[PDB]
Amino acid sequence: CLGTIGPVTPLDASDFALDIRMPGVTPKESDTYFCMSMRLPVDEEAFVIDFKPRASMDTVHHMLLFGCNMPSSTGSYWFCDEGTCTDKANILYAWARNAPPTRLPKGVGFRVGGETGSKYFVLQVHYGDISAFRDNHKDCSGVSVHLTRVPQPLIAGMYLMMSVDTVIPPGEKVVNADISCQYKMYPMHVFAYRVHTHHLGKVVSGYRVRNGQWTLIGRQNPQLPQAFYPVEHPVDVTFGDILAARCVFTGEEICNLYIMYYMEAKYALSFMTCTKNVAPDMFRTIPAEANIPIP
């Protein structure tokens, strides 16, 4: 794993690869999350245009890569339940064993560095079940990243919808957490999504609503591989639209929908969020499919 090629590998006059890999780490308990950081080598703005997972296709179940400015630690590596970043950890990439890859569409890149872009990458690697006879070989799992200083026409970002707090009342088998915001920027084109709960989430769905008509962004059971699922055909969201989501919870709290989009570079923002339910009555009209469980 260790056996080396430099952290930075120039590719042509304006592109370089960044190899982001665990520094020969040895998981000891099943189910461990290890984190590392890597500063961008350039101070000027640059664009992330591709990723390649380099996962121990023995023990690694999951990887996440975040962009942020303040990694939770300055150590060679650390344990993620002490944090990923102290500031907002902007998710850029997810990999899970046996999930579909989700690729950056051509002409799309995440904008990093420069004035307002992320200064660091933070890698999180989830090691699952190990054995107690493991020879303490080292693991250097991670991700290789393709960066260019060539301006991309389309800039990728994340629209994070979060529920802020419903409670699961006593005597409840089903609870809906609803989230909705108006959209008032230049168009975004949603091309992947990821859902996240901890309370036994049943199904999480996100929609664009335009003139009262709902268009599915994506729906998934939150209990399975939390990578990014591709949107069958990218959904454009424009000024006047409402983003809406419903998390369906069972008795026997947090619901996040991460919506990965691109925007025209001239008009792009790298992140947006909704933590409100501005149009709660609209949910009376929500498609029935939003309440159908995904076992």
Contact residues toward Cu ion (CB under 5 A) are 61-62, 126, 199, 253
What does the angle CA 120 – CA 126 – CA 127 come to, to the nearest 5 degrees? 135
CB of 53 to Cu ion, least distance (A): 13
Query: For Cu ion, which is the closer residue by CB, 61 or 146?
Result: 61
Residue 102 and residue 229: Cα distance in Å, rounded?
7
Nearer of residues 180 and 197 to Cu ion, judged by Cβ = 197
Helix (H, G, I), strand (E, B) or coil at 215: strand
CB of 8: closest distance to Cu ion in angstroms?
A: 28
18 versus 64: smaller Cβ distance to Cu ion: 64
Whole-number minimum distance, CB 68 to Cu ion, in Å? 16
State the Cα–Cα distance between residues 71 and 144, nearest whole angstrom: 19
Specify the residue, 15 or 253, whose C-beta has the smaller distance to Cu ion. 253
Chain centroid offset of residue 116 CA: 19
Q: Which is nearer to Cu ion, 63 or 242 (CB)?
A: 63
Provide the minimum distance between the beta carbon of 78 and Cu ion in the complex, in angstroms, as a whole number.
Answer: 17
Phi-psi bin for 136: left (phi > 0), alpha (psi -120 to 50), beta?
A: left
Closest distance to Cu ion from the beta carbon of 275 (Å): 15
CB-nearer residue toward Cu ion: 16 or 127: 127
Report the nearest approach of Cu ion to the CB of residue 97 (Å).
8
Which 3 state secondary structure label does DSSP give 131? Answer: coil
Determine the Cα–Cα distance for residues 259 and 271; give it in Å rounded to an integer.
10
Q: In what order do the strands lie in the sheet with 120-127?
A: 78-79, 32-39, 120-127, 60-68, 90-96
What's the closest the beta carbon of residue 51 comes to Cu ion, in angstroms?
Answer: 17
Buried-state track 3-41, b at ≥16 Cβ within 10 A, e below 16: eeeeeeeeeeeebbbbbbbbeebebeeeebbbbbbbebe
CB closest to Cu ion, residue no: 62
Do β-strands 271-274 and 154-163 pair in parallel, antiparallel, or remain unpaired? parallel
Q: Which is nearer to Cu ion, 81 or 281 (CB)?
A: 81
154-163/60-68 β-pairing: unpaired
**What CA–CA distance (Å, rounded) separates 72 from 229?**
28
